[PDB]
Design a protein that fits this description.
It is found in: Secreted. By secondary structure, the protein is α+β, with helices and mostly antiparallel strands. It folds into three domains: about 60 residues, no CATH class; about 100 residues, no CATH class; about 110 residues, no CATH class. Helix content is about 30%, strand content about 20%. A five-stranded antiparallel beta sheet has the order 6-5-4-1-7, with no helix packed on it. The chain has a three-stranded antiparallel beta sheet with strand order 8-9-10. Strand 2 and strand 3 form a beta hairpin. Helix 2 packs across helix 3. The radius of gyration is 19 Å and the shape is globular. Bound molecules: calcium ion. Calcium ion binds next to loops.
Length: about 270
């Protein structure tokens, strides 16, 4: 088969030495890499920029004529990644080289046969501050019709987190937007945890960290990200090959999803970043 689906809750991706490089989520589709040797026990595969090996035990072959395979498609305005049959995210602007309504296939979401994507937020150094002020970040809730969010009017706590910990506030807003549904998840409301901290794939809600209030959740999650990711040399969102996505989340498109939110906010606030 050309495509394989991850069967267990998560599965490891290994190098040729058998060392763990990362892990990916149940349902993830990986591409068979025909330039490298596969055997009975391990397949050479690619996923979200990472070229390695997976145990055949963890995979199920798909048939692309009847099973969903992730793909990218232009509407003539934005290029979308279909990350699941019924969910698309906008990743870039339409390039004149894209045929409208044609499905395109890419292992990194950057290199395609007939064009290449800049996804600048995906690789943007997150220690650089946003050019958006507290008031500009706060205007995004109306501009995107975000209702009943615990993060409404917290632009000032985000810019404080950015001032004190040197982490990009537009990135902190986008990450909390994705992980907690803009501060509307049960974890968001119960534990002021907006970033999915220690919310492990095996038991996400049980292992989720508790913060005392919304402001301490923003500042406390920022301190955690700084100490566990930024300070250990994970300084951009990235994918399964590099950046925070190697270890932060099983979802191979976690970084792409956060970049997509940064892109949408940036566009609605006037393009200052
Ligand atoms: Ca090695």
């Amino acid at each position: 088969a050309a495509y394989y689906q991850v069967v267990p809750v998560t599965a490891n991706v290994y190098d040729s030495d058998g060392e763990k490089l990362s892990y990916i989520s149940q349902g993830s589709v990986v591409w068979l890499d025909k330039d490298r040797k596969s055997d009975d026990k391990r397949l050479a595969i690619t996923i979200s920029g990472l070229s390695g090996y997976m145990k055949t035990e963890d995979l199920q072959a798909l048939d692309a004529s009847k099973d969903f395979i992730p793909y990218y498609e232009s509407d003539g305005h934005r290029f979308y990644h279909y990350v699941a049959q019924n969910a698309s995210i906008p990743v870039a602007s339409h390039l004149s080289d894209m045929e409208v309504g044609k499905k395109y296939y890419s292992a990194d979401g950057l290199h395609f046969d007939g064009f290449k994507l800049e996804n600048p937020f995906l690789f943007k150094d997150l220690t650089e501050a946003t050019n958006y002020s507290a008031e500009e970040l706060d205007k995004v809730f109306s501009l995107l019709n975000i209702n009943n969010s615990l993060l409404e009017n917290k632009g000032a706590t985000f810019k404080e987190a950015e001032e004190h910990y040197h982490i990009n506030a537009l990135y902190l807003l986008a990450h909390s937007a994705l992980e907690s549904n803009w501060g509307r998840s049960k974890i968001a409301k119960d534990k002021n945890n907006f970033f999915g901290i220690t919310a492990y794939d095996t038991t996400p809600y049980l292992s989720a960290k508790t913060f005392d209030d919304v402001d301490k959740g923003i500042l406390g999650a920022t301190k955690w990200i700084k100490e566990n990711y930024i300070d250990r040399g994970r300084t951009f969102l990235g994918n399964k090959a590099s950046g925070m996505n190697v270890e932060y989340a099983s979802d191979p498109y976690w970084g792409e999803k956060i970049a997509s939110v940064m892109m949408k906010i940036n566009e609605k606030l006037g393009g200052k970043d």
